[PDB]
């Protein structure tokens, strides 16, 4: 849920938190 | 309006899944590997693997499974893409041609519903009576597999559960039975049903519902002797079969998590398990024999087996050889021993497979100052993360390069008896031949008084049997070497100057006028043997040993000046065999026929640069494949070098490009040299593997590296690299990396493995005095490190320790203000586990001295630093939805001038001229102008209809490009309309495209030396490299017309229409392609056959293959 390393995982290709979760959080 | 182009530079390398079974036949053992959009097929031998087929699909592969219905020898393949394309395919080897047909087709997409986590799952009945699919939550799709239903009709079944993790069909049941694991409140369970495809409802499974430990994610179906299932989690291996229950809790698991499995014993007695950080496992199933009943087991046993990389897919192959499938690192192939070596390990590796993995960041760097830079990336992960130096072409390693003008021929000789490596070289200028002597690194001249010194010859070397050859237009002659004098003389009995000759290793063939003299070089004397005038003139010849013959070639090849043709012809009696015509009229200058593998090739190099091919076999010599290709303008000679046991031929053209055969196809890999004319081998003692080579005015020698198009040199660091920068005057690199570390019971933490992060030659630690404010006894922590790597030897010269836990994000090297010094600048963010948004960061500027590393200023920053770039002489940064510009004073300080904080998570950032493109996480692209006179930011244009961008750059001064997380591209554009009140803050999407992959970084530059405008490279998670450039009107219209005429006819493997996949897509929004040209398609035009190219548009074909050619070389 912490942004820098969830974006890090997304960069590496590991399963990141869904975009709809960020939509709700934003 | 906006006309663009996207093409592929390097195909993806990460492995998503692998299975084994019976495609090629019922008695073969196949290995199937699925890339992102690539499928590849491997069959098993006793020493390793071998490739047979490569295919690409218009979609992201998500399901791959094997099954055996009743009444055929081999298995069937089921594939389901990302846009929910469902297909049934299988393997047809008809003759030598291999193809894969679609025995079904369909689309299982719905209207209402949500794609969920864990992705798509596809399983198959052990009796092959249906195919189950989980696509949307709460709804399970069943495909019937009756002999009809060619269209893959499906039907739906409602579920009382919405969150499914894994699903498999059971073994040894009466009717198709399902057992699966699902998520709901109060933990996760495993629980079973029975299907009824007659009445379409789930009835009842063979046993009741039970509970499983809280994080099981992995189900194994036991075969017939035991039946039931194996459930794998953390500190749990479990067996369920009706009523019987057993489990073990090995203490080893705590630190790491299992990933994949593959059944070892067809009976089901041993198992392979793959760990999250390398240790491959072995699981034991111990069985007992009942006095009268069926077999049963007692317990379970595990054992630490060996060491591997991180595993994504894992398959026990046979006889203790095992494939390790890695997505975050290099995959390798392992042998398990029967006796454990020291430290107790059974593992022995045989091969490794390179994997660029997730390309986190990259830069373009030009090392040797010529007009060609090379790319250095941050690849790999926790334990495999390394640096890759991707170089287009092979790098030369010169030792003796001299500006020597044009050389027609250049030969070796041996001045002693048939000793080891030769000791002499023979030159030849424009109209004569000169003999050198090679006594080491020095060069000297000495004319032997047994040769010619005033007139040019074709052949000068030796063949065998203690003698030397003299092939000339004026005479043919043989030389004795112990006297180093002459033995006999002969002359052509026509007084006519020869055109060409030929001799490599045992016999000479000389072609005079319209006829051709022959003699194979006999010991100390020569007689004519064969003679036959050719109907038309002769241009070139080729005589070589092709196999089981010590030089004597049964066949001979003849070239022709005016209308190019090859003639297969016997050496001994010069009788005609076959006539075969070739295209063009432009003049050739050499032809060669040479062996590399069992399929012999003859290669002819034509005058336009175009390289053509006919087929030759020793027995008969029928015509094999044929294709029209062109190359650099200057005329070409091919003659062969020695590299390996299957050594290959080189060529001379506009620019040297060495052809290579990998399995059966010719690879067109180039090399970094300006121009060449002619060659010969040198194998001296101090020059072990060099080659003597002629140029227009140059002589080049060197050493030979790898063979395929891309040079990767893996530099292990054991480091997780993040970003990379260059600082040329400092003669080094700056690299970020970060280390895995566990807290100990003593409060402090020591280490896990030795790493370059702590094994530095010299080290230093950040010493801030402005942070002042909980870690447990045993947990994981992360430490961050700056690495200075020597630009020449690629060794860590220095390593700087940032503060404990400072998660460093950005790096840049530039000159600021009026300072003449170059610096290293970092933006960081002290990340906390408890909180959710970075509140702070530091901007540290580094001086790297002769051998030390100094620190100048800190100037704490109130948030994270996602991106920076020097603006003109200023420092432009991006901090937590803000954009700011900075100034470098004379007193070594930094000050703020003007802010902007309207955005939300302004993350990507690029600058051009006096305009700023700020990319965004969720909203859109957006443009700023820096207004000099009063000095702040003022918005030019924006974009509504939000997208989730993943990379942003500036193509030109007028259009703008982004990339978003749903695998799509789009080139925005400014609208030229009047009434500048509110609609001039509106930017226009003009191009639409479904790339298919995730883009991590955009960079300007090109990996080539020094038709379209603009140039851009990007790297993806799957290890792909892509390129994008803009186009004008004419080629766009031509190429889109051609795109229609090509995608109308081309057959997808699942026969999905090419328009559908390349079409833009999103969760909410979908339109076809526009504004863009697809390189995948356009360079796929070349695998199309010649006839079917005449059923291409047919206003011709060559005029467009030239177009695809010129668009090809941009990457």
Coordinates of N, CA and C in Angstrom, one line a residue, chain B residues 168-358:
Chain B
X168 N -8.1 -27.8 -9.7 CA -7.7 -29.0 -10.5 C -8.7 -30.1 -10.5
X169 N -8.8 -30.8 -11.6 CA -9.6 -32.0 -11.7 C -8.9 -33.2 -11.0
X170 N -9.7 -34.0 -10.3 CA -9.2 -35.1 -9.5 C -9.0 -36.3 -10.4
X171 N -8.3 -37.3 -9.9 CA -7.9 -38.5 -10.6 C -8.7 -39.7 -10.1
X172 N -9.0 -40.6 -11.0 CA -9.6 -41.9 -10.6 C -11.0 -41.7 -10.1
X173 N -11.9 -40.9 -10.7 CA -13.3 -40.8 -10.4 C -14.2 -41.2 -11.5
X174 N -15.4 -41.5 -11.2 CA -16.4 -42.1 -12.1 C -16.8 -41.1 -13.2
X175 N -17.2 -39.9 -12.8 CA -17.6 -38.8 -13.7 C -16.8 -37.5 -13.3
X176 N -16.6 -36.6 -14.3 CA -15.7 -35.5 -14.0 C -15.9 -34.7 -12.7
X177 N -14.9 -34.7 -11.9 CA -15.0 -34.2 -10.5 C -14.0 -33.1 -10.3
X178 N -14.4 -32.1 -9.5 CA -13.6 -30.9 -9.3 C -13.3 -30.8 -7.8
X179 N -12.0 -30.5 -7.5 CA -11.6 -30.1 -6.1 C -10.7 -28.9 -6.2
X180 N -11.0 -27.9 -5.3 CA -10.3 -26.6 -5.5 C -10.2 -25.9 -4.2
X181 N -9.4 -24.8 -4.2 CA -9.2 -24.0 -3.0 C -9.7 -22.6 -3.3
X182 N -10.5 -22.0 -2.4 CA -11.1 -20.7 -2.6 C -10.9 -19.8 -1.3
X183 N -11.1 -18.5 -1.5 CA -10.9 -17.6 -0.4 C -12.3 -17.0 -0.1
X184 N -12.5 -16.8 1.2 CA -13.7 -16.2 1.7 C -13.5 -15.7 3.1
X185 N -14.4 -15.1 3.8 CA -14.2 -14.9 5.2 C -14.0 -16.1 6.0
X186 N -13.3 -16.0 7.1 CA -12.9 -17.2 7.9 C -12.0 -18.1 7.1
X187 N -10.8 -17.6 6.7 CA -9.8 -18.5 6.1 C -10.2 -19.0 4.7
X188 N -9.4 -19.9 4.2 CA -9.5 -20.6 2.9 C -9.7 -22.1 3.1
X189 N -10.5 -22.6 2.2 CA -10.9 -24.0 2.3 C -10.6 -24.8 1.0
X190 N -10.7 -26.1 1.1 CA -10.7 -27.0 -0.1 C -11.9 -27.8 -0.1
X191 N -12.7 -27.9 -1.2 CA -14.0 -28.4 -1.2 C -14.4 -28.7 -2.6
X192 N -15.3 -29.7 -2.8 CA -15.4 -30.4 -4.0 C -16.8 -30.5 -4.5
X193 N -16.9 -30.7 -5.8 CA -18.2 -30.7 -6.5 C -18.2 -31.8 -7.6
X194 N -19.3 -32.1 -8.1 CA -19.5 -33.0 -9.3 C -20.3 -32.2 -10.4
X195 N -19.8 -32.3 -11.6 CA -20.5 -31.6 -12.7 C -21.5 -32.5 -13.3
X196 N -22.5 -32.0 -14.0 CA -23.4 -32.7 -14.9 C -23.7 -31.9 -16.1
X197 N -22.9 -32.2 -17.2 CA -23.0 -31.4 -18.4 C -24.4 -31.7 -19.1
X198 N -25.0 -32.8 -18.8 CA -26.4 -33.0 -19.3 C -27.4 -32.0 -18.7
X199 N -27.3 -31.7 -17.4 CA -28.2 -30.8 -16.8 C -27.6 -29.5 -16.3
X200 N -26.3 -29.3 -16.4 CA -25.6 -28.1 -16.2 C -25.7 -27.6 -14.8
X201 N -25.2 -28.4 -13.8 CA -25.2 -27.9 -12.4 C -24.2 -28.8 -11.7
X202 N -23.7 -28.2 -10.6 CA -22.8 -28.9 -9.7 C -23.5 -29.7 -8.7
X203 N -23.2 -31.0 -8.6 CA -24.1 -31.8 -7.7 C -23.5 -32.1 -6.3
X204 N -22.4 -32.8 -6.3 CA -21.7 -33.3 -5.0 C -20.4 -33.9 -5.3
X205 N -19.3 -33.5 -4.6 CA -18.1 -34.2 -4.7 C -18.0 -35.4 -3.8
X206 N -16.9 -36.2 -4.0 CA -16.8 -37.5 -3.3 C -16.6 -37.3 -1.8
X207 N -16.2 -36.2 -1.3 CA -16.0 -36.0 0.2 C -16.5 -34.7 0.6
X208 N -16.5 -34.5 2.0 CA -17.0 -33.3 2.6 C -16.1 -32.2 2.6
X209 N -16.4 -31.1 3.3 CA -15.7 -29.9 3.3 C -14.9 -29.7 4.6
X210 N -13.6 -29.4 4.4 CA -12.7 -29.3 5.5 C -11.9 -27.9 5.4
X211 N -10.9 -27.8 6.3 CA -10.2 -26.5 6.4 C -8.7 -26.7 6.1
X212 N -8.0 -25.7 5.6 CA -6.6 -25.7 5.2 C -5.9 -24.5 5.9
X213 N -4.6 -24.6 6.1 CA -3.9 -23.6 6.7 C -4.0 -22.3 5.9
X214 N -3.8 -21.1 6.6 CA -4.3 -19.9 6.1 C -3.7 -19.4 4.8
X215 N -2.6 -19.9 4.3 CA -2.0 -19.4 3.1 C -1.6 -20.5 2.1
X216 N -2.3 -21.6 2.1 CA -2.1 -22.5 1.0 C -2.5 -21.9 -0.3
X217 N -1.7 -22.1 -1.3 CA -1.9 -21.6 -2.7 C -1.6 -22.6 -3.8
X218 N -1.5 -23.9 -3.5 CA -0.8 -24.8 -4.4 C -1.3 -26.2 -4.2
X219 N -1.9 -26.8 -5.2 CA -2.6 -28.0 -5.2 C -2.0 -29.0 -6.2
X220 N -1.7 -30.2 -5.7 CA -1.2 -31.3 -6.5 C -2.2 -32.5 -6.5
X221 N -2.6 -33.0 -7.6 CA -3.5 -34.1 -7.7 C -2.7 -35.4 -7.8
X222 N -2.9 -36.3 -6.9 CA -2.1 -37.5 -6.8 C -2.7 -38.5 -7.8
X223 N -1.8 -39.3 -8.5 CA -2.3 -40.2 -9.5 C -3.0 -41.4 -8.9
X224 N -3.3 -42.4 -9.8 CA -4.2 -43.5 -9.4 C -3.8 -44.3 -8.2
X225 N -2.5 -44.7 -8.0 CA -2.3 -45.6 -6.9 C -2.7 -45.1 -5.5
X226 N -2.6 -43.8 -5.2 CA -3.0 -43.3 -4.0 C -4.3 -42.5 -4.2
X227 N -4.4 -41.6 -5.2 CA -5.5 -40.7 -5.4 C -5.4 -39.6 -4.4
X228 N -6.4 -38.7 -4.5 CA -6.5 -37.6 -3.6 C -5.6 -36.4 -4.1
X229 N -5.3 -35.6 -3.1 CA -4.6 -34.3 -3.4 C -3.4 -34.1 -2.5
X230 N -2.5 -33.2 -2.9 CA -1.4 -32.7 -2.1 C -1.6 -31.2 -2.0
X231 N -1.6 -30.7 -0.7 CA -1.8 -29.3 -0.5 C -0.5 -28.7 0.1
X232 N 0.0 -27.6 -0.5 CA 1.3 -27.0 -0.1 C 1.0 -25.6 0.3
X233 N 1.7 -25.2 1.4 CA 1.6 -23.8 1.9 C 2.9 -23.4 2.6
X234 N 2.7 -22.8 3.8 CA 3.9 -22.5 4.6 C 3.8 -23.4 5.9
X235 N 4.9 -24.2 6.1 CA 4.9 -25.2 7.2 C 3.7 -26.1 7.1
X236 N 3.5 -26.6 5.9 CA 2.4 -27.6 5.7 C 2.6 -28.3 4.3
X237 N 2.7 -29.6 4.4 CA 2.5 -30.5 3.3 C 1.5 -31.5 3.7
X238 N 0.4 -31.6 2.9 CA -0.8 -32.3 3.4 C -1.3 -33.3 2.3
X239 N -1.9 -34.4 2.8 CA -2.5 -35.3 1.9 C -4.0 -35.5 2.3
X240 N -4.9 -35.4 1.3 CA -6.3 -35.7 1.5 C -6.7 -36.7 0.4
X241 N -7.4 -37.8 0.9 CA -8.0 -38.7 0.0 C -9.2 -39.3 0.7
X242 N -10.4 -38.8 0.4 CA -11.6 -39.2 1.1 C -11.5 -38.9 2.6
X243 N -11.3 -39.9 3.4 CA -11.3 -39.8 4.8 C -9.9 -39.7 5.4
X244 N -8.9 -40.3 4.8 CA -7.5 -40.4 5.4 C -6.9 -39.0 5.4
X245 N -6.2 -38.7 6.5 CA -5.6 -37.4 6.7 C -4.2 -37.5 7.3
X246 N -3.2 -36.8 6.8 CA -1.9 -36.8 7.3 C -1.2 -35.5 6.9
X247 N -0.2 -35.1 7.7 CA 0.5 -33.8 7.4 C 1.9 -33.8 8.1
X248 N 2.8 -33.0 7.6 CA 4.1 -32.7 8.3 C 4.3 -31.2 8.3
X249 N 5.2 -30.8 9.2 CA 5.5 -29.4 9.4 C 7.0 -29.2 9.5
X250 N 7.7 -29.4 8.4 CA 9.2 -29.3 8.4 C 9.6 -27.9 8.9
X251 N 10.7 -27.8 9.8 CA 11.1 -26.5 10.3 C 11.9 -25.7 9.3
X252 N 12.2 -26.2 8.2 CA 13.1 -25.5 7.2 C 12.4 -24.3 6.6
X253 N 11.1 -24.4 6.4 CA 10.4 -23.5 5.5 C 10.4 -22.0 5.9
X254 N 10.5 -21.7 7.2 CA 10.2 -20.4 7.8 C 10.7 -19.2 6.9
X255 N 11.9 -19.3 6.4 CA 12.6 -18.1 5.8 C 12.0 -17.9 4.3
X256 N 11.8 -19.0 3.6 CA 11.4 -18.8 2.2 C 10.2 -19.6 1.8
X257 N 9.6 -19.2 0.7 CA 8.3 -19.8 0.2 C 8.5 -20.6 -1.1
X258 N 7.7 -21.6 -1.2 CA 7.7 -22.5 -2.4 C 7.0 -21.8 -3.5
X259 N 7.3 -22.2 -4.7 CA 6.7 -21.6 -5.9 C 6.0 -22.6 -6.8
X260 N 6.8 -23.5 -7.4 CA 6.3 -24.4 -8.4 C 6.5 -25.9 -8.0
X261 N 6.0 -26.8 -8.8 CA 6.1 -28.2 -8.6 C 6.1 -29.0 -9.9
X262 N 6.6 -30.2 -9.9 CA 6.4 -31.1 -11.0 C 6.6 -32.5 -10.5
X263 N 5.6 -33.4 -10.8 CA 5.6 -34.7 -10.3 C 6.8 -35.5 -10.9
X264 N 7.5 -36.2 -10.1 CA 8.7 -36.9 -10.5 C 8.4 -38.3 -10.9
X265 N 7.7 -39.0 -10.1 CA 7.3 -40.4 -10.3 C 5.9 -40.5 -10.9
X266 N 5.8 -41.1 -12.1 CA 4.4 -41.3 -12.6 C 3.5 -42.0 -11.6
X267 N 4.1 -43.0 -10.8 CA 3.4 -43.5 -9.7 C 3.0 -42.5 -8.7
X268 N 3.9 -41.4 -8.5 CA 3.7 -40.4 -7.5 C 4.3 -40.8 -6.2
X269 N 5.7 -40.9 -6.2 CA 6.4 -41.2 -5.0 C 7.4 -40.1 -4.6
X270 N 8.0 -39.4 -5.5 CA 8.9 -38.3 -5.2 C 8.4 -37.1 -6.0
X271 N 8.7 -35.9 -5.4 CA 8.2 -34.7 -6.0 C 9.3 -33.6 -5.9
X272 N 9.2 -32.7 -6.9 CA 10.1 -31.6 -6.9 C 9.4 -30.3 -6.5
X273 N 10.1 -29.4 -5.7 CA 9.5 -28.2 -5.3 C 10.5 -27.1 -5.4
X274 N 10.0 -25.9 -5.8 CA 10.9 -24.8 -6.1 C 10.7 -23.7 -5.2
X275 N 11.8 -23.1 -4.7 CA 11.8 -22.2 -3.6 C 11.7 -20.7 -4.1
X276 N 11.5 -19.8 -3.2 CA 11.4 -18.4 -3.7 C 12.8 -17.7 -3.8
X277 N 13.8 -18.4 -3.4 CA 15.2 -17.7 -3.5 C 16.3 -18.7 -3.9
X278 N 15.9 -20.0 -4.1 CA 16.9 -20.8 -4.8 C 16.9 -22.3 -4.5
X279 N 16.6 -22.7 -3.2 CA 16.9 -24.1 -2.8 C 15.8 -25.0 -3.4
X280 N 16.2 -25.8 -4.3 CA 15.3 -26.9 -4.9 C 15.1 -28.0 -3.9
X281 N 13.9 -28.6 -3.8 CA 13.6 -29.5 -2.8 C 13.3 -30.9 -3.4
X282 N 13.0 -31.8 -2.4 CA 12.6 -33.2 -2.8 C 11.6 -33.6 -1.7
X283 N 10.5 -34.2 -2.1 CA 9.5 -34.6 -1.2 C 9.3 -36.1 -1.3
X284 N 9.1 -36.8 -0.2 CA 9.1 -38.3 -0.2 C 7.7 -38.7 0.2
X285 N 7.2 -39.7 -0.6 CA 5.9 -40.4 -0.3 C 6.2 -41.8 0.0
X286 N 6.0 -42.2 1.2 CA 6.3 -43.6 1.7 C 5.0 -44.4 1.8
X287 N 5.0 -45.5 1.0 CA 3.8 -46.3 0.9 C 3.9 -47.7 1.6
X288 N 2.8 -48.3 1.9 CA 2.8 -49.6 2.4 C 1.8 -50.5 1.6
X289 N 2.0 -51.8 1.6 CA 1.1 -52.7 0.9 C 0.2 -53.4 1.9
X290 N -1.1 -53.2 1.7 CA -2.1 -53.8 2.5 C -2.1 -55.3 2.2
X291 N -2.6 -56.1 3.1 CA -2.6 -57.6 2.9 C -3.6 -57.9 1.8
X292 N -4.7 -57.2 1.6 CA -5.6 -57.5 0.5 C -6.0 -56.2 -0.2
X293 N -6.0 -55.1 0.4 CA -6.5 -53.9 -0.3 C -5.5 -53.2 -1.1
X294 N -5.9 -52.0 -1.6 CA -5.0 -51.2 -2.4 C -3.9 -50.6 -1.6
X295 N -2.9 -50.0 -2.4 CA -1.7 -49.4 -1.7 C -2.2 -48.1 -0.9
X296 N -1.3 -47.8 0.0 CA -1.6 -46.6 0.9 C -0.2 -46.1 1.4
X297 N -0.2 -44.9 1.9 CA 1.1 -44.3 2.4 C 1.1 -44.2 3.9
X298 N 2.3 -44.0 4.5 CA 2.4 -43.6 5.9 C 2.6 -42.1 6.1
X299 N 3.7 -41.5 5.6 CA 4.1 -40.2 6.1 C 4.8 -39.5 4.9
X300 N 5.4 -38.3 5.3 CA 6.0 -37.4 4.3 C 7.4 -37.0 4.8
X301 N 8.4 -36.9 3.9 CA 9.7 -36.5 4.3 C 10.3 -35.6 3.2
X302 N 10.9 -34.5 3.7 CA 11.6 -33.5 2.9 C 13.1 -33.6 3.2
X303 N 13.9 -32.9 2.3 CA 15.3 -32.9 2.4 C 15.9 -31.7 1.6
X304 N 16.8 -31.0 2.2 CA 17.5 -29.9 1.4 C 18.3 -30.5 0.3
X305 N 18.1 -30.2 -0.9 CA 18.7 -30.9 -2.0 C 19.9 -30.1 -2.6
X306 N 19.6 -28.9 -3.0 CA 20.7 -28.1 -3.7 C 20.4 -26.6 -3.8
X307 N 21.1 -26.0 -4.7 CA 21.0 -24.5 -4.9 C 20.8 -24.2 -6.4
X308 N 19.8 -23.3 -6.6 CA 19.5 -22.9 -7.9 C 19.1 -21.4 -7.8
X309 N 18.7 -20.8 -9.0 CA 18.1 -19.5 -9.0 C 16.7 -19.4 -8.5
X310 N 16.1 -18.3 -8.6 CA 14.7 -18.2 -8.2 C 13.9 -18.8 -9.4
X311 N 12.9 -19.6 -9.0 CA 12.2 -20.5 -9.9 C 10.8 -19.9 -10.1
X312 N 10.4 -19.8 -11.4 CA 9.0 -19.5 -11.8 C 8.3 -20.8 -12.2
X313 N 8.9 -21.6 -13.0 CA 8.4 -22.9 -13.5 C 9.5 -23.9 -13.3
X314 N 9.0 -25.2 -13.0 CA 9.9 -26.2 -12.6 C 9.4 -27.6 -13.1
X315 N 10.2 -28.3 -13.8 CA 9.9 -29.6 -14.4 C 11.0 -30.6 -14.2
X316 N 10.7 -31.7 -13.5 CA 11.6 -32.9 -13.5 C 11.5 -33.5 -14.9
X317 N 12.6 -33.7 -15.5 CA 12.6 -34.1 -16.9 C 12.8 -35.6 -17.0
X318 N 13.9 -36.1 -16.6 CA 14.2 -37.5 -16.4 C 15.6 -37.7 -15.9
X319 N 15.9 -38.9 -15.3 CA 17.2 -39.3 -15.1 C 18.1 -38.2 -14.4
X320 N 17.4 -37.6 -13.4 CA 18.1 -36.6 -12.6 C 18.6 -35.4 -13.3
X321 N 18.0 -35.0 -14.5 CA 18.2 -33.7 -15.1 C 16.9 -32.9 -15.0
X322 N 17.0 -31.6 -14.6 CA 15.9 -30.8 -14.2 C 16.1 -29.4 -14.8
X323 N 15.0 -28.9 -15.4 CA 14.9 -27.5 -15.9 C 14.5 -26.6 -14.7
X324 N 15.2 -25.5 -14.6 CA 14.8 -24.5 -13.7 C 14.4 -23.3 -14.5
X325 N 13.1 -22.9 -14.3 CA 12.6 -21.7 -15.0 C 12.5 -20.5 -14.2
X326 N 13.3 -19.5 -14.6 CA 13.5 -18.3 -13.9 C 12.9 -17.1 -14.7
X327 N 12.1 -16.2 -14.0 CA 11.6 -15.0 -14.5 C 12.4 -13.8 -14.0
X328 N 12.9 -13.8 -12.8 CA 13.7 -12.7 -12.3 C 15.2 -12.8 -12.5
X329 N 15.7 -13.9 -13.0 CA 17.1 -14.1 -13.2 C 17.4 -15.1 -14.3
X330 N 18.6 -15.6 -14.3 CA 19.1 -16.6 -15.3 C 18.5 -17.9 -14.9
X331 N 17.9 -18.6 -15.9 CA 17.5 -20.0 -15.8 C 18.6 -20.9 -16.1
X332 N 18.6 -22.1 -15.5 CA 19.7 -23.0 -15.7 C 19.2 -24.4 -15.7
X333 N 20.0 -25.3 -16.2 CA 19.7 -26.7 -16.3 C 20.7 -27.5 -15.4
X334 N 20.1 -28.4 -14.6 CA 20.8 -29.0 -13.5 C 20.8 -30.5 -13.6
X335 N 21.9 -31.1 -13.1 CA 22.1 -32.5 -12.9 C 22.1 -32.8 -11.4
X336 N 21.3 -33.8 -11.0 CA 21.3 -34.2 -9.6 C 22.1 -35.5 -9.5
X337 N 23.1 -35.5 -8.6 CA 24.0 -36.7 -8.4 C 23.3 -37.7 -7.5
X338 N 24.0 -38.9 -7.4 CA 23.5 -40.0 -6.6 C 24.3 -39.9 -5.3
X339 N 25.5 -39.2 -5.3 CA 26.3 -39.1 -4.2 C 26.6 -37.6 -4.0
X340 N 26.4 -37.1 -2.8 CA 26.5 -35.7 -2.5 C 28.0 -35.3 -2.3
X341 N 28.4 -34.2 -3.0 CA 29.7 -33.7 -2.9 C 29.9 -33.0 -1.6
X342 N 31.0 -32.2 -1.5 CA 31.3 -31.5 -0.3 C 30.2 -30.5 0.1
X343 N 30.0 -30.3 1.4 CA 28.9 -29.5 1.9 C 27.6 -30.2 1.7
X344 N 27.6 -31.4 1.0 CA 26.4 -32.2 0.8 C 25.5 -31.6 -0.2
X345 N 25.9 -31.6 -1.5 CA 25.0 -31.1 -2.5 C 25.1 -32.1 -3.7
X346 N 23.9 -32.4 -4.3 CA 23.8 -33.3 -5.4 C 23.8 -32.7 -6.7
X347 N 23.9 -31.3 -6.8 CA 23.5 -30.6 -8.0 C 24.8 -30.3 -8.8
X348 N 24.7 -30.4 -10.1 CA 25.7 -30.0 -11.1 C 25.0 -29.4 -12.3
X349 N 25.4 -28.2 -12.6 CA 24.8 -27.5 -13.8 C 25.5 -27.9 -15.1
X350 N 24.8 -27.7 -16.2 CA 25.4 -27.9 -17.5 C 25.3 -26.7 -18.4
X351 N 24.1 -26.0 -18.4 CA 23.9 -24.8 -19.2 C 23.3 -23.7 -18.3
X352 N 23.4 -22.5 -18.8 CA 22.6 -21.4 -18.2 C 22.0 -20.6 -19.4
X353 N 20.8 -20.0 -19.1 CA 20.1 -19.2 -20.1 C 20.0 -17.8 -19.7
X354 N 20.5 -16.9 -20.5 CA 20.5 -15.4 -20.2 C 19.1 -14.9 -20.1
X355 N 18.8 -14.0 -19.2 CA 17.5 -13.3 -19.1 C 17.7 -11.9 -18.6
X356 N 17.4 -10.9 -19.4 CA 17.5 -9.5 -19.0 C 16.5 -9.2 -18.0
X357 N 15.5 -10.0 -17.8 CA 14.5 -9.8 -16.7 C 13.9 -8.4 -16.7
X358 N 13.4 -8.0 -15.6 CA 12.8 -6.6 -15.5 C 13.8 -5.5 -15.7

